[PDB]
């Protein structure tokens, strides 16, 4: 048997948010938790929920699982509507990359022995600057796999080569002791709307005018800067036409900003004059 290079760990929206929150809720200590999910068949690992684990001093190791805690919370989740498995464990690496180091391989070996499909997800919450989420999923390579003359994981689809690995992980052996399974976040149509509500602008913000004093100051400043750019532009056009750009591009961006601001505020003003009387 082999693990295809199309396997994906579909991390749900709730799981991703919980992971990032727990990472920056305990940086620069490391944090750990379980990933309740579902092994669909052989190419899918669905991480439906994640599962914080109390900080226990011994970093993140096998002794940091606290069997009483996990058992009791799994029972309680079962009776509240989560009859889910334990597909792997996530554990943050606060700022020093997304890979594994020794104890991680030992712990993931424990999880695999429990069930040989459990992934291990690593999140770097400091490097997760807004606009880039650094999460990577991993699983081990059998000692009799790369030494017996077999590639770590077969390849039947062109899917597994659309993401390039990072040198940070290469150094620690992204391809000598463990894989890298793709993520492929799974978003419903309701979660996306509920999240859009985060920055959704109110009708008030749509229909509210801009402080006229500040608007006039902005008009004046932009028109002056545009005058300077226009003098430079005259000089540039004369010089280029004589001897045979930055002024033109800056002038274009500034004209854009002035026109958008003025038209928007003027139309808002008329709309209000009609709507509120």
């Amino acid at each position: 048997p082999a693990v295809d290079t199309a396997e994906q760990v579909y991390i749900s929206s709730l799981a991703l948010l919980k992971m990032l929150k727990h990472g920056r809720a305990g940086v620069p200590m490391e944090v750990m938790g379980l990933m309740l999910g579902e092994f669909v068949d052989d190419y899918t690992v669905r991480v439906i929920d994640v599962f914080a684990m109390p900080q226990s001093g011994t970093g993140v190791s096998v002794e940091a699982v606290d069997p009483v805690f996990q058992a009791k919370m799994l029972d309680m989740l079962k009776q509240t509507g989560r009859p889910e498995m334990v597909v792997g464990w996530y554990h943050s690496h606060p700022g020093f990359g997304c890979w594994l180091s020794g104890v991680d391989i030992n712990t993931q070996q424990s999880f695999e022995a429990l069930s040989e499909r459990a992934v291990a997800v690593v999140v770097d919450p400091i490097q997760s600057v807004k606009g880039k989420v650094v999460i990577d999923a991993f699983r081990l390579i059998n000692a009799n796999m790369m030494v017996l003359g077999h590639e770590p994981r077969q390849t039947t689809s062109n899917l597994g080569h659309l993401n390039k690995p990072s040198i940070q992980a290469l150094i620690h052996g992204l391809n000598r002791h463990y894989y890298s399974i793709t993520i492929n976040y799974r978003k419903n149509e309701l979660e996306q709307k509920m999240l859009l509500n985060l920055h959704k602008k109110s009708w008030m913000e749509g229909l509210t005018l801009q402080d006229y004093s500040e608007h006039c100051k902005h008009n004046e400043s932009v028109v002056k800067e545009m005058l300077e750019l226009a003098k430079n532009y005259n000089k540039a056009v004369e010089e280029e036409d004589k001897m045979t750009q930055d002024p033109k591009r800056h002038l274009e961006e500034h004209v854009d900003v002035l026109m958008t601001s003025n038209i928007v505020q003027c139309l808002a003003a008329m709309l209000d004059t009609v709507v509120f009387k």
């Binding site: 001093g57 009859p83 334990v86 069930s115």
Partner: protein
């Protein structure tokens, strides 16, 4: 009967969770699980609500839920799965089933096997079966046999978590 690869889900049923609401004390739940002609009777009305629980999630291919052939047999079988709480004969009459079988005498007979929509039963821990109507119309309903045919889903049985490698002191 049993296509290769699928096995009867008797061994994975734990009595810790099995129950059957509205059952006559004369004929108990143990009757439906012997393959003998020992039956289960309805107590008050022409309705019944069985519930079976499995140790590890299982996949259900077919059901052998059959009764006698004297007009006292299940007619409308509503199957729900994975119920957080034991339900009542009032929710059983409106809740949308995961399956809505309407048995016929052919299925009722000893050689009748009713196949379910396999896809909706890919992870089953608890099954509640509501018999809403009898084959004809009898104040008491009777069930002669009931067993599921399917496959078990590989279990990640926590509490088995142990050090398979290394010392007992590494932290990170």
């Amino acid at each position: 009967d049993i296509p290769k690869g699928y096995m009867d889900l008797m061994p994975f049923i734990n009595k810790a969770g099995c129950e059957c609401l509205n059952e006559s004390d004369e004929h108990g739940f143990d009757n439906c699980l012997r393959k003998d002609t020992t039956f289960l009777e309805s107590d008050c009305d022409e309705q019944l609500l069985i519930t079976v629980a499995f140790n590890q999630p299982v996949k259900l291919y077919s059901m052998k839920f059959q009764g006698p052939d004297n007009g006292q047999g299940p007619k409308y079988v509503k199957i729900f799965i994975n119920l957080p709480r034991s339900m009542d004969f009032e929710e059983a009459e409106r809740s949308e089933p995961t399956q809505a079988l309407e048995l016929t005498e052919d299925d009722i007979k000893e050689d009748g096997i009713v196949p379910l929509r396999y896809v909706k039963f890919q992870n089953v821990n608890s099954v509640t079966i509501f018999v809403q109507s009898n084959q004809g119309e009898e104040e008491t309903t009777r069930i002669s046999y009931f067993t599921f045919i399917g496959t078990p889903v590989q279990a990640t049985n926590m509490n088995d978590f142990k050090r398979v490698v290394g010392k007992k002191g590494e932290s990170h």
